[PDB]
Amino acid sequence: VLLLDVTPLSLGIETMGGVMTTLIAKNTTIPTKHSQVFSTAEDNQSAVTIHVLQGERKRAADNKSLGQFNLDGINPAPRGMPQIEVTFDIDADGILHVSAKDKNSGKEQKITIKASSGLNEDEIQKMVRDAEANAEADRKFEELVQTRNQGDHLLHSTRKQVEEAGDKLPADDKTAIESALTALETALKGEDKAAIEAKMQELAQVSQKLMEIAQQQH
Amino acid sequence: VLLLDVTPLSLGIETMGGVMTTLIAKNTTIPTKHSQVFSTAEDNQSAVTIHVLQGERKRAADNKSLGQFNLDGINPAPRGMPQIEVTFDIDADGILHVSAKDKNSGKEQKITIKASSGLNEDEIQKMVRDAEANAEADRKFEELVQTRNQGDHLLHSTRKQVEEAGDKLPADDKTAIESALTALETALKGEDKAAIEAKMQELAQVSQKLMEIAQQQH
């Protein structure tokens, strides 16, 4: 072949923390099809938003939005339990089909994005240059999002474990634990990574008895 | 400057599923220092192994092992709760210091790896070429590991939720759920991604009442 039709930029979705998660890499030859399973981020969440992105930046807001749609009707479940399979499918014609399917109900929603959508050649080359220019700042953002996300998971799991512990947890530990939870919930709202790590560390240091109780319970 | 001293290859650690998680990217100028927090993969795990890697492959076993060491003394806790902070620090002399610290106890262990360790120039260029040659197969492996890991998390969380539900779960659902758990536990041992996804989907389809109970409990 003298040519190849290729994706000039990565294609993906926005995920927890405001980051772009890539489903099809930059420079993939078409046709191609890739899927990844995602879940809900909150207890009893009934809908998830699929925001389709094109570009190479780590911050979703720094990429080109190709559109969005919601999958609703998700049944009541703890965060992290439902399985929403997201498929990016680019056919021979260069048309992008993005689908989200709830694996429990088999309910599906789709967006179709024609071959001419997204960034033009001038914008693609600016995108490529910016991603390279900003590699370092993008890495810092990605490390912060990972920290915040782990903090959020620890916040919620620890709250659940306090409840299941009930009376087994000494009153003094519950006091120490609840204060550190408030402090971490506050810190998660900012973008100071060190502060999140410090509240996470305070939690770990005061939760040792809770931890033993939770392990014992299962 | 007419030169820069740079990392010719990524540096990282082996994480759940046998994958390389990168801490310092290929082509980073030294000195540099980066950290990421990790956790345990099993309930009541008392030690984690830090296996240091150099290279660009997704499979840890396809990279150059720079050494390994264990952090023990982790206190009894549910999987996913303990915070083990891993720091990769390369000083002005090109020496790599890797430390793991338990944020609960402040217990730390380190490996020091001198500037001359790892792959020589012939091996680095073979590594660079192989990673490029194998981009596709490495992507397939990474998607499989992600699937297996999500399966493992769903396996364990669902077992925990059955226990906390106790009598609230109807006997018939518990039967359906326990069968699907056995089937998924089996599937996680292989490398058939579709099969893992099919057992995960069977679980989701039979767990809707359990899910409602678990959400209700918190």
Partner: peptide, 7 residues
């Protein structure tokens, strides 16, 4: 709302 990881 946003999607997160399966745990």
């Amino acid at each position: 709302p946003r999607p997160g990881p399966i745990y």
